From Swiss-Prot, chains A, B:
Region (Extended region for STAS domain): 493-674
Protein name: Prestin
UniProt domain STAS: residue ranges: 513-669
GO CC terms, sorted: plasma membrane
Main location: membrane
Annotated organism of origin: Tursiops truncatus (Atlantic bottle-nosed dolphin)
Protein family per UniProt: Belongs to the SLC26A/SulP transporter (TC 2.A.53) family.
Site (Contributes to anion binding): R387
Regions that enter the bilayer but do not cross it: 232-236
Disulfide bonds: none
Stated role: Voltage-sensitive motor protein that drives outer hair cell (OHC) electromotility (eM) and participates in sound amplification in the hearing organ. Converts changes in the transmembrane electric potential into mechanical displacements resulting in the coupling of its expansion to movement of a charged voltage sensor across the lipid membrane. The nature of the voltage sensor is not completely clear, and two models compete.
Residues bearing glycans: N151, N154
Length: 678, 678
């Protein structure tokens, strides 16, 4: 009770206004830096070169004597992990693996040339390109290509080249739109994608891909289906075709999968410093190819296989404007959605170390990567998670050996072509399924958010379900829409609370939560913790009337009833704001409360609008007509301006209805009542 | 300086917490009123009957000796005005006028049976039904109907019946969806449509209809065009076809229009009590028909005409489910959009007198009206503005003679059929163009909003332009989307202001606006007037760092530079929140400011989320690591809960970082500094 002594005069609005003067702070050419920019200063040019090219400044900063070795081992490990994942994803998107290797190779060096993140991976998604191949199959049948005179019995390479072409088209579209959007300084557009939304989205995608690799584990072939409920159709078709599968395929897949989990668990039991990360994928692939060569795991057992690798560089084939118009006409939505996923994933992965990274810069860098790749016969690209978890778990922070991993895979795409034609698909399916562990453990958020709140759980469940059932593009877009809608909903249902003054103090708290605060007689206090705009005004008015229990409508009606019942015989603009009491000391007083002023707390109201101003004017006019005073709380500049600009401050007297604190309003009302005693 | 004496102990968080206890207030069966509802009490049943049927209670309340006469004259005037408008709109939507009369007649009595507003009109729009007829023309050509063996040369009645059928279908759809949506207690969905949006939308519609009636003034026929840029095509086609028009048609139209404006202006110059409202439409129609009969204003002059009226009652033809599926498959969007326009217009017109009106109730009442009409071969319905402006300007508040106006038009639709076959279209076009005066004067909002703000002008212009160029449905839907987006945008760009304490007081105001307040040395204050959620957190962090000028990144970097430069020779979980000073009294102090605590004002933060909590934790951890204290402002229950539920309140010490006022935080920090002096 020692400190916090105030003893202050009562500032309503005008007193504090007169206590102060104004400033200017403003010059000419506001925002018009062009008249002061545009010089040949070396500083601006060199800085522009710096921020469009970071490797210039990455050049010196490189440590040694263990930093080099850690970097190199990191790059080697990440490349050897990237390889089989590239193969698997290329097989996923229904393309010969050589183009998956092209994707694994070219954008890596492109990014190393352009990119500020110290950690990176390439090609974590093929499902959207899958849906694109589905649309292309919907365009041309899988067996009716050209009935000409080539005298080919049944070759499926033509449709495959078709799918490659459509992938090139969509990826060029994506890269170009990415350059276009990045150059406009939209490092902010990524912000609209929230953590729970991304979590649920990625989990749904993991489910989709697991369902897809189920069949390539089973060996039993099946026509692929895309579109709405695509997972449903594919799953039920596979379960129908369980009859007549390959038992040896399932056996080898299960054996290798179990061995891989056993190795990973055994390594994880001895996770010490001396044990360095071991590339399980490399052992998996070498043993798979060795066993395939040993026991003749091919047409000898009639099991599936990789097939011949077109070992050799391909010059960049020109994308000819023949049907690019028509194809992007219906590829636009898919391009932009797969886009938004990629950019969001990349940027959220960027914020790992306490380091600053430019947004639009990385956008443009990836745009160059994408356009160049698609011109080099390459599909879409982004950064896969676990790969940086390697670069970081390896301890290699720099990206040098990371991009050197591309030169490392260069030998495979240049030297070893016979080494890889013989290999099944179940092995790759096992690889990806094992990789899916973290995404499948992402489910922990359900009880956590359940205990946490309702809104974030709602968004997570809705985006997950929509992405699962419907296509990925539709799921994402509806998720974003509802994400922006939840904010409106939250501002639709605020917490209307009536205050109660803590005794002999100036703090005001809700009454019905503590059974220790009491309310000052004859006054009422009403607080809304949400801005007042068009969609939220009438709720506020009605809630106020029904919560203060002072609804003037029935008050007036009961007054009329009482007066007519007591009635048994004959016995510049001077606009008054608050009417005097219409009562003439009758004896038919409607039992209830006697409140003489109402206090509207505005400490939470961030902004207003025309509709809010109209509603406030209505409230003021109504209560003054009844004969009840009202006051506001908080002479903030924004709200003062909002009232002023709108047709409110004609100052009949309304400037005399402001306060800069709740307590000031309380004291002022009490003083007015006291002065009323003549 | 007399009043407002406080002398209060310093409540941070825990002190005020211990000062109070809690309550319960909660029983079982929360929200489960079903166990206490569901009885045979006459009260609930009678009230339900009351709120599903108001005319029961309208029955007694009816005044006399001038109230009857005013009501009757109001009803007669409104009917005689409704008639020609009904004719014009029916001609607008490309339908024989008899069905326009059906629309003018049946829903009126339906509404009188079901509806609580004392003022009403019917059938203010036909443009959406026009676009529907456009789609139907897009379905079947205007001249290729059935090449059979009927031996009819060229009759256009078949396509007209087709358009009537499609109108019936869409209107049944609308009525049924209206019942469906109203029964679910959505009196709130109308709230999303704001005043400026509706203003711009209605103005755009007025422009469209004026463009449409241009040709029917010109007499020069033209194939009608709908869709995107529809106004553009129709306008340019008419201006191309200006050659070979009918001069007599234009002459009579201009003469009658000028005479009508002259009469209206002359009446408005003598707007006194004794002059009662005169129905200008009635004089217009009678003189038009008289002159048409006199000088043979028909095929004698080859000018246009109304044509024969199918005088007679039509039994309700059954809507057969033959192509209803296919037609609503692409009529859904148009139905729902024309819907939303109608409901919004009706409800906003309801709030005229200080009276309460139920929303979902009126929704269901209009749904019955619409379904019954569409079953009786009737198109869509709503309330036109000026008509109630008549009912009110006439002074007739009750709706009795208003619905009796339907019985008044009954004579025309039953007795006078020869009286109206002979009449041109330019007269009706003049009627509607004259009616458009208020909608065309709605343009005044442009400079008003220009001086007012930017957001509402933005929304008004955008909705107006989109409705003009594109179709009405597209314009409306994009307007609603951007309307909900502007709120997000407003929360994206708050007003970051740094406070300055008013001397020897406890009020804190922005420094750089008044050049009279000063800041307390060693402290800094930061206020955001917007909630902190996912889409708005990083903006807040970065703005804070760059505005307080205390960005710890460069502070740490400069500290490292200074230390290495001064370096020239060798000479339960105890988690500390704020680190001590890492400085060891060097001499290379980076020149700048010395601030020892930061104050985050939360009096505006309405709510938070997971991302906001993470960002706050990051800020706290960072600044404590640097060695800078921080504090919050406002121990509100909502924000306290938000921090608590999220992984924040493990109370290492964080409960000791709260305050219920800015001044409390200031004093507490000063006390901590003072106590630091040992």
């Amino acid at each position: 009770t020692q400190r916090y002594y105030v003893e202050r005069p009562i500032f309503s609005h005008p007193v504090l206004q007169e206590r102060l003067h104004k400033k200017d702070k403003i010059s000419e050419s506001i925002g018009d830096k062009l008249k002061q920019a545009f010089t040949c200063t070396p500083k601006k040019i060199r800085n522009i070169i710096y921020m469009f090219l970071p490797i210039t400044k990455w050049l010196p900063a490189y440590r040694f004597k263990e930093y080099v070795l850690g970097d190199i081992v990191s790059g080697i490990s990440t490349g050897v992990l990237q390889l089989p994942q590239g193969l698997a994803f290329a097989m996923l998107a229904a393309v010969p693996p050589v183009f998956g290797l092209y994707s694994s190779f070219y954008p890596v060096i492109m990014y190393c040339f352009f990119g500020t993140s110290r950690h990176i991976s390439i090609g974590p998604f093929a499902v959207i390109s899958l849906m694109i191949g589905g649309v292309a199959v919907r365009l041309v049948p899988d067996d009716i290509v050209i009935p000409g005179g080539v005298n080919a019995t049944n070759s499926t390479e033509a449709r495959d080249a078709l799918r490659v072409k459509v992938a090139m088209s969509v990826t060029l579209l994506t890269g170009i739109i990415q350059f276009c959007l990045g150059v406009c300084r939209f490092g902010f557009v990524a912000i609209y994608l929230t953590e729970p939304l991304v979590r649920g989205f990625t989990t749904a995608a993991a489910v989709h891909v697991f369902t897809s690799m189920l069949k390539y584990l089973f060996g039993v072939k099946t026509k692929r289906y895309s579109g709405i409920f695509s997972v449903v159709y594919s799953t039920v078709a596979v379960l129908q075709n369980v009859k007549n599968l390959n038992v040896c395929s399932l056996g080898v897949g299960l054996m290798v999968f179990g061995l891989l989990l056993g190795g990973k668990e055994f390594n994880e039991r001895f996770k010490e410093k001396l044990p360095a990360p071991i590339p399980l994928e490399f052992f998996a692939v070498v043993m798979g190819t060795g066993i395939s060569a040993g026991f003749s795991l091919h047409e000898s057992y009639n099991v599936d296989v990789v097939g011949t690798l077109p070992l050799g560089l391909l010059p960049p084939a020109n994308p000819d404007t023949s049907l690019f118009h028509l194809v992007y006409v219906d590829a636009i939505a898919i391009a932009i959605v797969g886009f938004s996923v990629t950019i969001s994933m990349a940027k959220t992965l960027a914020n790992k170390h306490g380091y600053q990274v430019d947004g639009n810069q990385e956008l443009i860098a990836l745009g160059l990567c994408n356009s160049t790749g698609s011109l080099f016969q390459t599909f879409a690209i982004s950064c896969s998670l676990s790969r940086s978890l390697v670069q970081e778990g390896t301890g290699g922070k720099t990206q040098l050996a990371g991009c050197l991993a591309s030169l490392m895979i260069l030998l495979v795409i240049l030297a070893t072509g016979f080494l890889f034609e013989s290999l099944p698909q179940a092995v790759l399916s096992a690889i990806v399924i094992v990789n899916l562990k973290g995404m499948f453990m992402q489910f922990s958020d359900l009880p956590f958010f359940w205990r946490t709140s309702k809104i974030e759980l709602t968004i997570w469940l809705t985006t997950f379900v929509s992405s699962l059932f419907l296509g990925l593009d539709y799921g994402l877009i509806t998720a974003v829409i509802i994400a922006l809608m939840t904010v409106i909903y939250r501002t639709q249902s605020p917490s209307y609370i009536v205050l109660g003054q803590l005794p002999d103090t100036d703090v005001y708290i809700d009454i019905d939560a503590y059974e220790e605060v009491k309310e000052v007689p004859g006054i009422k206090i009403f607080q809304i913790n949400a801005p007042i705009y068009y969609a939220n005004s009438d709720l506020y008015s009605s809630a106020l009337k029904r919560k203060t229990g002072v609804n003037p409508a029935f008050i007036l009606g009961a007054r009329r009833k009482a007066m007519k019942k007591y009635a048994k015989e004959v016995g510049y603009p001077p606009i008054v704001t608050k009417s005097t009491l219409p009562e003439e000391l009758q004896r038919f007083m409607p039992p209830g409360d006697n409140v003489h002023t109402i206090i509207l707390d505005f400490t939470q109201v961030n902004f207003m609008d025309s509709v809010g101003v109209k509603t406030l004017a209505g409230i003021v006019k109504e209560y003054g007509d009844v004969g009840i005073y009202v006051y506001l709380a908080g002479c903030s500049a924004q709200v003062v301006s909002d009232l002023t600009q709108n047709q409110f401050f004609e100052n009949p007297a309304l400037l005399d209805l402001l306060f800069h604190s709740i307590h000031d309003a309380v004291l002022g009302s009490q003083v007015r009542e006291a002065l009323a005693e003549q």
